[PDB]
Design a protein around this nucleic acid. Structure first.
Ligand code: FES
Ligand SMILES: [K+]
Ligand SMILES: [K+]
Ligand SMILES: [K+]
Ligand SMILES: [K+]
Ligand SMILES: [K+]
Ligand SMILES: [K+]
Ligand SMILES: [K+]
Ligand SMILES: [K+]
Ligand SMILES: [K+]
Ligand SMILES: [K+]
Ligand SMILES: [K+]
Ligand SMILES: [Mg+2]
Ligand SMILES: [Mg+2]
Ligand SMILES: [Mg+2]
Ligand SMILES: [Mg+2]
Ligand SMILES: [Mg+2]
Ligand SMILES: [Mg+2]
Ligand SMILES: [Mg+2]
Ligand SMILES: [Mg+2]
Ligand SMILES: [Mg+2]
Ligand SMILES: [Mg+2]
Ligand SMILES: [Mg+2]
Ligand SMILES: [Mg+2]
Ligand SMILES: [Mg+2]
Ligand SMILES: [Mg+2]
Ligand SMILES: [Mg+2]
Ligand SMILES: [Mg+2]
Ligand SMILES: [Mg+2]
Ligand SMILES: [Mg+2]
Ligand SMILES: [Mg+2]
Ligand SMILES: [Mg+2]
Ligand SMILES: [Mg+2]
Ligand SMILES: [Mg+2]
Ligand SMILES: [Mg+2]
Ligand SMILES: [Mg+2]
Ligand SMILES: [Mg+2]
Ligand SMILES: [Mg+2]
Lengths: 170, 108, 216
RNA sequence: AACAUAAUUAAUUUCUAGACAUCCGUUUAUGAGAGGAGAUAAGUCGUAACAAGGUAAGCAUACUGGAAAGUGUGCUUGGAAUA
RNA sequence: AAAGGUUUGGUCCUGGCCUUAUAAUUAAUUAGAGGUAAAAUUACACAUGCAAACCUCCAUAGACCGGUGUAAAAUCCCUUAAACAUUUACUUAAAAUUUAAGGAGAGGGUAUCAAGCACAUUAAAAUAGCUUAAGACACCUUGCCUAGCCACACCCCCACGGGACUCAGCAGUGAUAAAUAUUAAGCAAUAAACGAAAGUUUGACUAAGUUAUACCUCUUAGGGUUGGUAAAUUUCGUGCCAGCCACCGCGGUCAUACGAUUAACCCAAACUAAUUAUCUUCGGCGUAAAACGUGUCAACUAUAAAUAAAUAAAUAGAAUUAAAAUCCAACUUAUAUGUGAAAAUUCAUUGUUAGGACCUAAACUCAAUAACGAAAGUAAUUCUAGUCAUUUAUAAUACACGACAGCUAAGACCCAAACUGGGAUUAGAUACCCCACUAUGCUUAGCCAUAAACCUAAAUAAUUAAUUAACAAAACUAUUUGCCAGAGAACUACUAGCCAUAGCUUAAAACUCAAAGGAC
């Protein structure tokens, strides 16, 4: 049995379900939440379930969490321009908190798709090379082309050993 | 252990694989120094043929000679291999029959 | 890290080596000396190419001509036998400055500056002359300067535009139709912007390398 | 130690010279001689433990003894407990 | 891992070892031919030949290619700036390739390497800081990041200098090693260098030679095995011998286990042996390895409540005393004492005292009680001081404690008692039993820091059903820390700290074994 409570949180599939990919402006997200209370239940669930997913998709964003420092829970984002975006998450479900931050400071689906395509621009199917980078190592693999001499011996007249003998014979 | 304790320690530390009589090498070449008999620890009863050899590394070891009858003498050259002789305690080397001075067992 | 220790000897060697080079720089009289019997340079023991043997015995170096002239021939015109044979149009340098090698016992090695007129076309500024140590130079006489320097330019006949390569022309015309541009104009390359100098055109002596001072 | 010549094309020269030698230490090998552990394995002297093992056993500690061990003090049951 | 063999008289649990799969190197035995890939003991010393030129002189190139794995925890990934020993463009910009200063994160081993010792900041020049159990520092080992990268180039990290003065370029040799390719051909292709160019050059490379190391196509057949795990034995010989096994094991006269035969089995141009590598923590801690002798304070990780205490033996101090001893005195038996029975011891004894002294030592009944305290520990009586609120769990390298025994100095001393002496017993009796008497148990100061310090149960908050390995003490979830990783060697060696000096805490390896261990 996987240790801890809700061990599904420690699976790559769960971490990849996060949908909040912050814009490049976002640099820090401080989380102020209270461990005891009734109006902070969604905030506690947000730290338990959602903070891992956010960090997984935003590795370069500093997430620092402070406990029981204020009467109410809130989220404050620090942007590269110097702006500070304060969010109040009291009486809000953990799902509601995720949706709010996605709207205000989350990249749109269109932007993310464009970045994905740009990443793969330099992979070409026609390119030949090692398996790590290319589909086929050699043109011998292609159908109709002359096969590899190791797998299929070449005709004698196509061999340097034979041609050299003729040149000596001439 | 807790997940915090597994994190602070990481994977189990692995003791290093200490080498044996051949020092992690398939074979060694040695010069015979003495030929003697060793008695197998009970419950077995025999006069097992062994020899002391000076290995190429420079150390000296005791090597069991397998087969029925050997012509080995002092100053001969032999190729030793690994493998302990189960009844003979401390004998962790064996001589290879058919290499250098040691020869194949004479078939009867 | 912090175990990458300093290397005092390496730094000392670099500086010391560089200093010795400046102190013991060779001179033109030594680097470009020649043994005419073997046509081999004593400094490095480099034998000149075979195609240069005839001229090394039959032609003069630039400062051999200039050492015999007042003011080292400032203002005089000098041409090269290679140019005289290759180009019908006048090719010459108009000498402006000349720094002889005082060390030479005949003042036959040095540097020069002047204004180039190649194939009848004259440059606008003076620059250092290359290949001054070559056995190829011919001083122009003062009385023959007017006839030598007389040149009338012919109208340029080298094509200014050419067709595009067969495939590259089809790719251009195909793009026109795709973009809606309808025309039967033939794509044409413009060669005026990228016209090549002759292969023997004088090069920039200022940016050229000099041989080292270690004898072979 | 870093200036001085030169200057009616302009350049020359300086742009240095000692001392970077020992180290204080730090590891490893050698081992006079003195010990330990284990195995070889027919023995010797006792019978300490396992039965209430014939004085229940053991722990810490002290002293004592051919040898296991003995005795004291507190503690444990991984002993017993009706006459 | 779809697992298997092996602890026992037997079963169950726990747990190590080994087997079955895969690949490389070497060795034994054995092999035809062809195609392909790869070639590898050694940063050891190198005989000879070659590996860099080109070209109208100047220049450019010889900084590459090729080689090795030297050094170094060395790096990976990323940011910034700047040039470039360049290219191609412009009189001003696109690249390729580098260099310098850095840092989100990641990055080998040993903590018996626990402290490093200037490792910081400010900018009147003062302040006293910086790194480190979230692993500094020290030491050891290693090429990694793999379309490739990094370091090295005879040695002295460097290379002015000095020295033991160059193949870690191709082929080749010496020595060494278990480890064994041609002192070969050509610049025709591609790549590089040079030239404006026709072209020239190249041990890069191309095409060959060599080699069962691998793959592929064919042809021949050899190699090992045959007790179990694990596919497969006939007969004889041997007789605990000769030999055999990876593990368990086999051989003392009917050996399916050895040797030779016979027949079968497996793989097959190979086959078997040795060596090496490939598999790697969500499991446990009453009885099997494992909860620390005890408590308190930090930083994290978790948790969420707002109290506690409220005269039964905590602790410390002072005072106090009932019973039984001891001493002294009076009287007094002739013996007293002691054992299963004796002996020695003793008559300086013995018994009585409603006689005196003593205040040493220890606290019956209550106690069939289950309180107090962190634990250790604490119960004769009285008085004084005194336990109490941090939400909760979680601490060492700090602090304060810690039975008994023991050490140090000065006292106490009723009784008990190691040692010692005397007496018995016994084959002996350095013991058990008897008698005597010390250290010691007591007080006051200090040390020592160990217990089967064991409820053999870490603490805390839940649950009692959607739950029998065995036994013990019903099962089980969550949180945090500690601890464990076969047995012995080993409460050991070395290291460091300590009032400890025949000490305590900390705590390995070689080597040996195939088990050890728990419950029934
Ligand atoms: S791998 Fe393509 S010819 Fe061999
Ligand atoms: K046997
Ligand atoms: K006993
Ligand atoms: K006994
Ligand atoms: K007993
Ligand atoms: K097993
Ligand atoms: K070096
Ligand atoms: K070529
Ligand atoms: K028989
Ligand atoms: K057999
Ligand atoms: K057989
Ligand atoms: K107990
Ligand atoms: Mg030229
Ligand atoms: Mg007994
Ligand atoms: Mg007895
Ligand atoms: Mg004891
Ligand atoms: Mg005694
Ligand atoms: Mg006694
Ligand atoms: Mg071989
Ligand atoms: Mg290379
Ligand atoms: Mg190395
Ligand atoms: Mg040590
Ligand atoms: Mg060097
Ligand atoms: Mg060498
Ligand atoms: Mg060399
Ligand atoms: Mg070589
Ligand atoms: Mg080989
Ligand atoms: Mg070119
Ligand atoms: Mg056999
Ligand atoms: Mg067998
Ligand atoms: Mg235990
Ligand atoms: Mg006695
Ligand atoms: Mg006394
Ligand atoms: Mg202890
Ligand atoms: Mg106790
Ligand atoms: Mg102890
Ligand atoms: Mg000790
Ligand atoms: Mg010690």
């Amino acid at each position: 049995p996987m240790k801890g409570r809700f061990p599904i949180r420690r699976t790559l599939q769960y971490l990849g379900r996060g949908d909040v990919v912050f814009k490049e402006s976002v640099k820090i997200m401080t989380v102020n939440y209270n461990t005891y209370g009734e109006l902070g239940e969604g905030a506690r669930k947000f730290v338990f379930f959602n903070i891992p997913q956010i960090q997984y998709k935003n590795p370069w964003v500093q997430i620092m969490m402070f406990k029981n420092m204020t009467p109410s829970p809130f989220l404050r984002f620090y942007l590269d321009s110097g702006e500070q975006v304060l969010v109040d998450v009291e009486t809000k479900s953990n799902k509601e908190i995720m949706e709010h931050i996605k709207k205000i400071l989350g990249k749109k689906e269109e932007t993310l798709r464009e970045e994905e395509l740009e990443k793969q621009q330099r992979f070409h199917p026609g390119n030949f090379g090692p398996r790590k980078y290319c589909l086929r190592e050699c043109m011998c693999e292609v159908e109709g082309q002359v096969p590899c001499p190791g797998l299929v011996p070449l005709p004698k007249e196509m061999t340097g050993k034979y041609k050299a003998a003729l040149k000596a014979s001439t | 252990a807790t997940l915090n304790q597994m994190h602070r320690l990481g994977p189990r530390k692995e003791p290093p694989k200490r080498l044996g009589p051949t020092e992690g090498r398939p074979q060694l070449k040695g010069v015979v120094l003495r030929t003697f008999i060793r008695k197998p620890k009970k419950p077995n009863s025999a006069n097992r043929k062994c020899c002391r050899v000076r290995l190429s590394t420079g150390k000296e070891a005791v090597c069991f000679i397998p087969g029925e009858g050997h012509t080995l003498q002092e100053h001969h050259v032999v190729l030793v291999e690994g493998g302990r002789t189960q009844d003979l305690p401390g004998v962790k080397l064996k001589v290879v029959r058919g290499k250098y001075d040691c020869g194949h067992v004479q078939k009867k | 890290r912090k175990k990458v220790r300093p290397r005092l000897i390496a730094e000392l060697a670099r500086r010391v080596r560089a200093l010795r080079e400046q102190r013991n720089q060779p001179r033109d009289s030594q680097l470009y000396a020649l043994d005419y019997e073997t046509l081999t340079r004593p400094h490095s023991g480099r034998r000149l190419p075979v195609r240069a043997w005839a001229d090394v015995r039959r032609e003069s170096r630039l400062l051999q001509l200039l050492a015999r002239l007042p003011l080292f021939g400032l203002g005089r015109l000098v041409t090269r036998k290679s140019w005289l044979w290759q180009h019908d149009e006048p090719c010459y340098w108009r000498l402006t400055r000349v720094r002889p090698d005082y060390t030479a016992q005949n003042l036959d090695h040095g540097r020069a500056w002047g204004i180039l007129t190649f194939k009848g076309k004259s440059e606008d500024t003076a620059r250092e002359i290359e290949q001054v140590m070559y056995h190829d130079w011919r001083l122009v006489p003062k009385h023959e300067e007017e006839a030598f320097t007389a040149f009338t330019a012919k109208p340029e006949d080298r094509l200014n535009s050419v067709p595009y390569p067969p495939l590259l022309r089809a790719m251009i015309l195909a793009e026109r139709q795709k973009n809606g541009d309808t025309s039967v104009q033939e794509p044409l390359l413009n060669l005026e912007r990228t016209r090549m100098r002759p292969w023997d055109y004088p090069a920039k002596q200022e940016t050229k390398g000099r041989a080292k001072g270690t004898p072979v």
